[PDB]
Amino acid sequence: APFPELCSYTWEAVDTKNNVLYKINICGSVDIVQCGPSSAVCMHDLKTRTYHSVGDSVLRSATRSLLEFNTTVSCDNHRVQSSIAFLCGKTLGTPEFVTATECVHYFEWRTTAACKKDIFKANKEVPCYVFDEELRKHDLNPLIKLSGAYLVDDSDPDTSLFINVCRDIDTLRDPGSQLRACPPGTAACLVRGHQAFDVGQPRDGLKLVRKDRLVLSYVREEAGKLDFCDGHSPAVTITFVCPSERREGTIPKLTAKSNCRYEIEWITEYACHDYLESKTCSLSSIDLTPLSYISDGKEYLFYLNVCKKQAAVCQVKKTSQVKAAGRYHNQTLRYSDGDLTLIYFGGDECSSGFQRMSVINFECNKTAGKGTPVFTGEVDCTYFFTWDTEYACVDLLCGATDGKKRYDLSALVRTLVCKPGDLWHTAAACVLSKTEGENCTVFDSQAGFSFDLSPLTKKNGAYKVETKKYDFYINVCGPVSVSPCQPDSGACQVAKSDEKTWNLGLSNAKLSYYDGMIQLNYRGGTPNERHTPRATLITFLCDRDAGVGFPEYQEEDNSTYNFRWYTSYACPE
Ligand SMILES: *[C@@H]1O[C@H](CO)[C@@H](O)[C@H](O)[C@H]1NC(C)=O
């Protein structure tokens, strides 16, 4: 069970009560020296910051569904250990913590990498989760598409940008439907008509940036082409954002697309953090009461009941020596990020010091007509079962979409066809459309309201943006007005290393508007020796409670200069 697809990454799983993070490295070693040179599983336990390797990379073995890592440490029999129960899954997934004693530490992982046919596997998929400062857990595996992709919103009628979250786009399981042309392995495909291009491919996993912003980056350096990418390496950077009363809630939106450096922002509920728990046969949502049962073993044979005199799980040998492998009272039902896991603890103490536990991994399956538990292995008197059942079967948009034509209600937030700007027939109803203005204003004639950014326009244009290398000075609609730059430029780069500056483009007040984005483009700027004068993009984005806000430089090429500006000036009010 090497599972190549799980190499190269140091996964994370959390135990929410004890307040511990474990770091799993199945193919190698956690790269923490505090943990130790040969840790494949690592206890942190933030609460009293300490470290313990509860699994050595060398001392590894499999057993049916399980992978297990041993260590040469006494406890109490005596040896400390960690194990993962592997189930097949639709995405690469994450490991979820099950339970721990002073010796054993158990997990389960539902993943593509535990399927014995590769048709289900992605050309390339990446970890689609992160943990924040309070080990909360943000995870976008629900967004991952198995076939097809997400049309990214952009006014341009000619070209369309499709993406998948954390993996390549499977174009085969819908033959004929628009995407066929897309080069194999692409997570970001650019259609221009009948021709398709790979503008992005998975490499690293999901990142957490500035507290609460998930960033995912696709790249393509192993490349050619650059017909229209002027010697730029095509790249995609998506920013997932947890909705709020402030932040709209949306489909994904193209905020930049110069130099084949696509920048997408996507307000989606799956960006928010959650780990439920109960000693009952249900949670806060479905009950497991509707679910006597006879699971076959090696030498042995199992018997299980809904919810020892009692015994919820019973082992007998096919030899009528019988042992109980799970009580009734001592129970824990748990929903951990999509995974429903029931445990029993009762346990007749086996030869060794432990009491027999049963861990059941309920999978969702309609065509089960209830469902049946399969035995999937045993480790130090803990018996694992996977249960396909319908009774374990458990992203609300304000605006719809057309053959590329969007719709959005927002100014109607304290059947409808639209009306000329009236705002029940309402301007808010029908198609969204790009409009351009000037004098630091733009009028969305459809919706009936116009935006005016003019109060940002500074009279000596010090807006002060520090990269740890450069000091960008910019201004809105008006020009800059700072030490080295010309009073010409609306944007200006200045290295602190040197002090050497570059005009990033001449200012103008020619606003653009489309689907809640406002855009300033400066086009002068210092010259690749085709001509290539520098330019700046500044996408302004509605945030009801951002106020005026502040610009933020978007990391790209040496050569590309996009800033973002969250501000309530881009909002309808
Ligand atoms: C659900 O159970 C049926 C039983 O025949 C099986 O065919 C199918 O593969 C199962 N699906 C999943 C996703 O477990």
Q: How would you class 358 by CB atoms within 10 Å of its CB: exposed for 0-12, middle for 13-18, buried for 19 or more?
A: buried
Written as six digits, the tokens of 147 are: 């076939």
We find that the CATH architecture of domain 275-392 is Distorted Sandwich (2.70)
Q: Which of 304, 315, 384 is nearest to 350 (CA)?
A: 315
Best mutation site among 388, 391, 393 for ligand 1 pocket (most ligand atoms within 8 Å of CB): 388
Q: CA–CA separation, 519 vs 541, rounded Å?
A: 9
Query: Which CATH number describes the domain made up of 4-142?
Result: 2.70.130.10
Q: CA–CA separation, 145 vs 188, rounded Å?
A: 13
Q: Does the Cβ of 365 fall within 6 Å of ligand 1?
A: yes
Instruction: For residue 67, give the 3-state DSSP assignment.
Output: strand
Q: Which of 393, 383, 297 is nearest to 338 (CA)?
A: 393
CA 369 to ligand 1 center in whole angstroms? 12
Q: Resolution limit in angstroms?
A: 2.5
CA 391 to ligand 1 center in whole angstroms? 14
Written as six digits, the tokens of 6 are: 């799980």
Q: CA–CA separation, 14 vs 46, rounded Å?
A: 11
Burial 548-560 (b: 16+ CB within 10 A, else e): ebebebbebeeeb
Question: Is 139 in contact with 118 (CB distance < 8 Å)?
Answer: no
CA 287 to ligand 1 center in whole angstroms? 21
Question: Is 546 in contact with 572 (CB distance < 8 Å)?
Answer: no
Provide the CA 513 distance to its chain's centre, in angstroms: 28
Instruction: For residue 425, give the 3-state DSSP assignment.
Output: coil
Written as six digits, the tokens of 252 are: 């994904």
Best mutation site among 365, 374, 390, 393 for ligand 1 pocket (most ligand atoms within 8 Å of CB): 365
Name the β-bridge partners of 565: 540, 551
Q: What angle do CA 490, 494, 499 make, to 5 degrees?
A: 140
CA 368 to ligand 1 center in whole angstroms? 6
CA 385 to ligand 1 center in whole angstroms? 16
* Separation in Å, CA 506 to CA 258, 261, 336, 495: 17, 21, 53, 19
- Sign for the pseudo-dihedral over CA of 197, 203, 205, 207: negative
* Separation in Å, CA 367 to CA 58, 117, 370, 389, 390: 41, 20, 9, 8, 7
CA 367 to ligand 1 center in whole angstroms? 6
Q: CA–CA separation, 405 vs 70, rounded Å?
A: 57
CA dihedral 377, 379, 383, 389 (to 10 degrees): -50
Report which secondary-structure segment, H or E, holds 339: strand 339-344
Q: Does the Cβ of 367 fall within 6 Å of ligand 1?
A: yes
Q: CA–CA separation, 514 vs 404, rounded Å?
A: 14
Q: CA–CA separation, 363 vs 357, rounded Å?
A: 19
Instruction: For residue 548, give the 3-state DSSP assignment.
Output: coil
Q: Which of 32, 76, 85 is nearest to 360 (CA)?
A: 85
Best mutation site among 340, 367, 376 for ligand 1 pocket (most ligand atoms within 8 Å of CB): 367
Q: CA–CA separation, 288 vs 477, rounded Å?
A: 61
Same fold, 4-142 and 275-392: yes
CA 315 to ligand 1 center in whole angstroms? 26
* Residue 459 identity: K
